[PDB]
Design a protein around this ligand. Structure first.
Ligand SMILES: [Ca+2]
Ligand SMILES: [Ca+2]
Ligand SMILES: [Ca+2]
Ligand SMILES: [Ca+2]
Lengths: 221, 224
């Protein structure tokens, strides 16, 4: 018979296969330990294993994914008595940002491509137009919705990656933190009728994992 | 007094902060209380920031910062015992934290980002799939893992190609993309009176449950 009647572990979703994720039967706290097929949670015996049947330590056998599954009920049997180990997956930083709005493409987890829009009158000063209004507003968030603790959450950096015509940096500046768009110089429609830019949103923590969107800017009368 | 002149560990780049990554001082295999602490290494300054010994008496090494195979793959960790030092060489193993990239990948100046791609094709009107297939795309559609050194090779995901979205909306009637080769097939003759051009978005993703997709444009002109 078992000392507690149920047990609990957490595992970061990035934990490599082969890592030992629970040792709590060691130290008088639990004899041959083996994992049972759990009818109520079929995939748990595929995801976790006890390689050394005498110590009862549990090793991760398949790669986890917070987006697919966050809780496992692992039935462990001893030689007879069973117990349930509940294993909660902790969300890890394996995804980058997404721009909003994100309308999912049917039968995917991918956002439908997005082209933000702006329109600038010709021959008017930065002074009269700034900030330039983008529709919908430029806005990105982490696809990782439940990183803990909150101090581990990255910020997002916005930028203009590339664009046509190639002299766009002369006319536009994007704020790296707010995505606010600034005209730097009046535009003459005799020389520029439209700009087509690619905007980037990335994480500031050394793991950019960037998302991209379009920004089309019309130049009016 | 250390038992070996130097030591060696590997660590997967995805290993969470807080994980214990080397235990090889623990079973009488280190020095002969006995206190293990990490020194600043002048020749590798960031190693003492990346690794720590929280329990000074057991000498086990715990990862303190998140690793990145793309920035750095080898650490020289100086460990001192109280007194005598030794070097632990730590190799980072490439982990699956990046998805594919379409080729060619020409880097955008001052970024690590591929310049976006629009693949091109041009189909004559009124000609059969039989006479045109496979449709020639320029450059050829093709993606590879951004993770360049995954080991062993049996751990490498396969790549799945698809047409994500497109305009005009009846493109699936005329075009099929092979999920594994990216080969593009015309399914039906095109009449230029009804269809002049197609603008598609192509996706390349991993088949291992961690898609991490890349996207590219495919423009198709319909000629005389
Ligand atoms: Ca995640
Ligand atoms: Ca993230
Ligand atoms: Ca990698
Ligand atoms: Ca990969």
């Amino acid at each position: 018979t078992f000392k507690h009647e149920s047990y609990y572990a957490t595992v970061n979703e990035l934990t490599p296969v082969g890592t030992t994720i629970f040792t709590g039967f060691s130290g008088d706290n639990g004899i041959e330990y083996v994992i049972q097929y759990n009818p109520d949670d079929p995939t748990s015996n595929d995801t976790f294993e006890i390689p050394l049947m005498l110590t009862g330590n549990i090793v991760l056998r398949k790669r986890l994914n917070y987006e697919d599954k966050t809780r496992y009920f692992v039935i462990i049997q001893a030689n007879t008595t069973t117990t349930t180990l509940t294993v909660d997956v902790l969300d890890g930083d394996d995804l980058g940002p997404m721009f909003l709005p994100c309308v999912l493409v049917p039968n995917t987890r991918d956002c439908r491509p997005l082209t933000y829009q702006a329109a600038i009158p010709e021959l008017r000063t930065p002074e009269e137009l700034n900030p330039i209004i983008v529709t919908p507003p430029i806005q990105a968030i982490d696809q990782d919705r439940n990183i803990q603790p909150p101090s581990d959450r990255p910020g997002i950096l916005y930028s203009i990656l590339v664009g046509t015509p190639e002299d766009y940096p002369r006319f536009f500046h994007m704020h790296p933190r707010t995505a606010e768009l600034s005209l730097l110089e009046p535009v003459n429609r005799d020389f520029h009728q439209k700009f087509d830019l690619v905007i980037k949103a990335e994480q500031d923590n050394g793991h950019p994992l960037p998302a991209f969107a379009g920004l089309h800017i019309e130049i009016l009368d």
